[PDB]
Design brief:
Two copies of one chain form a homodimer. Chain A is of the alpha+beta class. Chain A has three domains: 85 residues, Rossmann fold, CATH 3.40.50; 287 residues, D-amino Acid Aminotransferase, Chain A, domain 1 (2-Layer Sandwich), CATH 3.30.470.20; 67 residues, ATP-grasp fold, A domain (Dna Ligase, domain 1, 2-Layer Sandwich), CATH 3.30.1490. In chain A, 35% of the residues lie in helices and 26% in strands. In chain A, α4 packs antiparallel against α5, α6 crosses α9 and α12 packs antiparallel against α13. Chain A is globular. Chains A and B meet through α1, β16, β17 and α12 of A and α1, β16, β17 and α12 of B. The complex binds phosphomethylphosphonic acid adenylate ester (2 copies). One phosphomethylphosphonic acid adenylate ester binds next to β8, β12 and β13 of chain A. It is classed as ligase.
């Protein structure tokens, strides 16, 4: 089965994967850039290989170097984590062709859901609800396009398979002409469609697992609406307002979609959720940053399941075994200025991480560690669990109050502002809320 | 109700109590000695009061100073934690007479279970199984005593209401004479009884809660057999080998005992468990160090329940709501030499605490903190949870491997030795095992 895994990532998720591997007795190979020799998981790994200099392009995105690392160590499998190459179908393809197991879906499935028109087509076919839209690429005939846009109803948004919002017919012809011409020079792909622009939605996403035994399960949902410039700040599970009846409906549709498309591994169906209706926007064909809140409310170890699935085993439980219990919250702690959001690299002179009942800390940072400039700014994920949403929130507030990260700036002050916001405490704020509140 | 609580303790348990208070919106008063100004919970408390110089006798055992702290701050209640004054009936009595709520049982109940002959009498009356014994204090008539000892069956142990084991009648007369004469000069109490000496037992203990609404519940059990010189090192829950049928039997008997004796708050019934039978040895009438493993397998917040009960509320759930799920382990991390077990006070130059899924860390220690000489040596409790005992163990091993405490010695190496022991991995080793293994 899986005896040795290359962890083709860094930071916190690399450590999360290492922990899962070690629990399963799987040997680890940490591939790393020159700037990441001091990463906690590298220091804990069974074997280490330097795959390039600091810049991501030369290291964590270096496909030949990563595959060569699997070859020399006689590894069986490669775990891409999230970001980097995790949704690069060329990578997945090269990994399998080279005789290693890619811990993720097949390349064909990555490419399928990597294209928005084809992803949407497959979801429609599978019975997953989608944003009303052109359903297919848009013509050049502006007459047909004004007809379609009128059908859908303004405002619409033009999107390449990057986006442009149109609130009247007055503007439709140019808007389609530009998004098409600017999306064709950016990525030799002039294909664009239109769909309804939802002005007041939440971000609600369904976690799935699918195995090579033909099983697929849903693991409730997460609300990730608390965002700034499309970057998630706080996530929670379950999503406030979502009943078990609604959960079973949408969840079961996502599970069926997995089987229809030949899905394998962990994945997430993202929806815009508005006026009680779900509308599909994307499938992330990988583990995600915010997976821990789902773990806390379902009792599933999502990274362990990824490894078991990749080894050819069935998912370790059945749908009927999963029941949402309690509530969980996650704050993404970033090394950045809490007001300008400019990164804040440098030496963590002192770290004090919080603890106690219902507090989980997923972080590679340690006292004496230097946060490098070269990658993203996430340094920790603080996760709380409680019997109710109110308890999870209070526990997060207290845990943040205990957290000390000296020597660099963090966004802890932003989390504190969010957690004490009366609207957030009520729950169900939309994806625009944080930017509105920040001014 | 409870608006303000004096935390009449220190170290990790003081922090645990502070966290519960803050979650409930209860104001905190940290009473502390001069040596504990730098304790994490003191730094987080709403109000602080110095109750004396470093030595415990002059501070944490200073009854007038602690009560005076409650008086001046206009506190409502005092939480004694464990150790110190938590099972001092004189303290409980003075706290209630002074108009404060003692977060614990009534003084009369403390004194009742604080005496072994009367504790045993009450348990017998309540239907809790006890070690076969004289049932009452022993005569002076050695004839009657040889009759009783013969009934019970050697080896017996003489115990003052400290202990002396007798393996033949040859020795019985003196043995009873001495334990009686050495227990009367030590604590003006010459009262001694005899009971069966169990040579091969495990330490299995049942957690209860009882409220002022007449409810009492049991929360499964813990195995605390891994001990050195009667000091617990590793605890787990549930106890290996214990079926749900057996759990309900013994558990329900403990719950009834609570109601029969007028119990209030959290408590623990300790048993020696041998050849499939339970034998009562003591009731701890307080929260215990190892409470977290029970929290992890039942989903109950035991310190929050203590506070709710003390405020006059019912226990927040019913017996039928509790079901054991998974398995949990706790390692007591002490600042001590891992071989000589001599304390190791001094400055923690660097702390790195472990994390991830299923890892809980309950500790007041932080980088830069100096562990003082004046109190016990416990610096942290590392707690893991898993679906199975095997997973909890592997997770504990990995978490220990990640743990760094620089500047002082710890017993982490002892925990590592224990966790990889094949007999411990099988489970069910007796209370003598660790001393035997250590030689
Ligand atoms: N029909 C619609 N109506 C309103 N907002 C929409 C929309 N379609 C997309 N959006 C918003 O624009 C975002 C699209 O982002 P984009 O497709 O460029 O990559 P992304 O990374 O931000 C989303 P993902 O997390 O799936 O990668 C969505 O997250 C959504 O918030
Ligand atoms: N009948 C018996 N047979 C065998 N061992 C016994 C016994 N009675 C007591 N013991 C052992 O001697 C110990 C008694 O310890 P003692 O009563 O002096 O205070 P203690 O603090 O060690 C127990 P506790 O944790 O309840 O305070 C028990 O823990 C038990 O291991």
């Amino acid at each position: 089965m899986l005896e040795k895994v290359v962890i083709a990532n860094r930071g916190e998720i690399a450590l999360r994967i290492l922990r899962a591997c070690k629990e399963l007795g799987i040997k680890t190979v940490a591939v790393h850039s020159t700037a990441d020799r001091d990463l906690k998981h590298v220091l804990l790994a069974d074997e280490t290989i330097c795959i390039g200099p600091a810049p991501s392009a030369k290291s964590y995105l270096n496909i030949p170097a990563i595959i060569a690392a699997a070859e020399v160590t006689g590894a069986d499998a490669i775990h891409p984590g999230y970001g980097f190459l995790s949704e690069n179908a060329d990578f997945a393809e090269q990994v399998e062709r080279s005789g290693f197991t890619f811990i993720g879906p097949t390349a064909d499935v990555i490419r399928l859901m990597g294209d928005k028109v084809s992803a949407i087509k497959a979801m429609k076919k599978a019975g997953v609800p989608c944003v009303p839209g052109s359903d297919g690429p848009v013509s050049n005939d502006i007459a047909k396009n004004k007809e379609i846009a009128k059908r859908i109803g303004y405002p619409i948004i033009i999107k390449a398979s990057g986006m442009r919002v149109v609130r009247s017919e007055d503007a439709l012809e140019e808007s389609i002409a530009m998004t098409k011409a600017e999306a064709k020079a950016a990525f030799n792909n002039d294909m664009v469609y239109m769909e309804k622009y939802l002005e007041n939605p939440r971000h609600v996403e369904i976690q799935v697992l699918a195995d090579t035994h033909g099983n697929a399960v849903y693991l409730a949902e997460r609300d990730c609406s608390m965002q700034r410039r499309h970057q998630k700040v706080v996530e929670e599970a379950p999503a406030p307002g979502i009943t078990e009846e609604v959960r079973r409906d949408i969840g079961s549709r996502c599970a069926n979609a997995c089987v229809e498309i030949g899905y394998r591994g962990a994945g997430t169906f993202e929806f815009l959720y508005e006026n009680g209706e779900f509308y599909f926007i994307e499938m992330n064909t990988r583990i995600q940053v915010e997976h821990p809140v789902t773990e806390m409310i379902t009792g599933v170890d999502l990274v362990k399941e990824q490894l078991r699935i990749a080894a050819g085993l069935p998912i370790s439980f059945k749908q009927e075994d999963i029941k949402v219990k309690g509530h969980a919250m996650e704050c993404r702690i970033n090394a950045e200025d809490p007001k300008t959001f400019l990164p804040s690299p440098g030496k963590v002179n002192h770290l004090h991480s919080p603890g106690g009942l219902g507090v989980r800390w997923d972080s590679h940072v340690y006292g004496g560690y230097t946060v490098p400039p070269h990658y993203d700014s996430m340094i920790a994920k603080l996760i709380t669990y409680g019997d109710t949403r109110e308890v999870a929130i209070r526990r997060m507030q207290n845990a943040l109050s205990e957290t000390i990260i000296d020597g660099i700036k963090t966004n802890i002050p932003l989390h504190e502002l969010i957690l004490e916001d009366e609207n957030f405490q009520k729950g169900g704020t939309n994806i625009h809320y944080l930017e509105k509140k920040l001014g």
